[PDB]
Design a protein around this ligand. Structure first.
Ligand SMILES: [Zn+2]
Ligand SMILES: [Zn+2]
Ligand SMILES: [Zn+2]
Length: 260
């Protein structure tokens, strides 16, 4: 919906002819998804009730207005310092809830609301910047790609040449992964998103050990915790024209392985 521009004032490089931009994640055929009958949406009377401890959607997060975004004021619609500092998962409304698309708790779901520019840095490859100012706790976009199984992810790491840097484009959806009860579905190896050939503009953001952005897990239906979203929020004020970066290290081994 929002435009994405690209500029290269440095060299003769351009995007690979096989790369494609996507709006939603593509789901691998073998990727298990919550059974129909398990899906449940809150029954809030009005979009306003959803921000309270009584909303069904927030029934999994502890207490301290319980939702992760600010109510009113200057930081309204922005991630709360509680979450920003805690890094807990974000429980949002979703397909199924009795609230409207306008629900104050559907911000990640509402999508990228900011134009972005892919640009060629002086000597570090492509990078991403924004023509408007981004405030701390502001949602920018999700990390998209093809959702695959750990088995397939492992295969891709062990069988691809390192020249492809599959490790850089594979992100595990392991927010609720834990070697325990919940079926290997949560006790076993997590699913992953592969953004090598199909992804959103965030695939072009550079890694930095002192990022201004960070990845947060956002959950729609609670039955799909194993396939949570990878949502990037600004963790610092980002004046328009400043390169966006996130810590790729914080299967590887393987890667590859295968191859050887
Ligand atoms: Zn609700
Ligand atoms: Zn809801
Ligand atoms: Zn809602």
């Amino acid at each position: 919906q929002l435009p994405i521009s690209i500029v290269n004032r440095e060299d003769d490089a351009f995007l690979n002819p096989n790369f494609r931009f996507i709006d939603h994640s593509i789901i691998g055929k073998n990727v298990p998804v919550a059974d129909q009958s398990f899906r449940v949406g809150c029954s809030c009377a009005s979009d306003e009730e959803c921000m309270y401890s009584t909303c069904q959607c927030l029934d999994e997060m502890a207490p301290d207005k319980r939702f992760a975004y600010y109510s009113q004021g200057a930081k309204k619609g922005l991630l709360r310092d509680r979450v920003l500092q805690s890094q807990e998962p974000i429980y949002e409304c979703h397909q199924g809830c009795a609230c409207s698309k306008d629900c104050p708790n559907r911000v990640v779901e509402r999508g990228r609301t900011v134009p972005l520019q892919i640009f060629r840095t002086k000597d570090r490859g492509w990078g991403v910047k924004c023509p408007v100012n981004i405030k701390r706790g502001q949602f920018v976009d999700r990390y998209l790609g093809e959702i695959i199984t750990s088995e397939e992810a492992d295969r891709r790491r062990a069988e691809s040449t390192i020249a492809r840097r599959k490790d850089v484009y594979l992100f595990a959806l392991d927010k609720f992964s834990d070697p325990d009860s919940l079926d290997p579905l949560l006790a076993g190896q997590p699913l992953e998103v592969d953004g090598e050939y199909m992804s959103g503009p965030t695939r072009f953001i550079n890694h930095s050990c002192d990022p201004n952005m960070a990845i947060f897990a956002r959950v729609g239906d609670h039955a799909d915790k194993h396939i949570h979203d990878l949502a990037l929020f600004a963790i610092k004020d980002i004046p328009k024209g400043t390169e966006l970066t996130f810590d790729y290290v914080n299967k590887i081994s393987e890667m590859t392985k295968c191859l050887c």
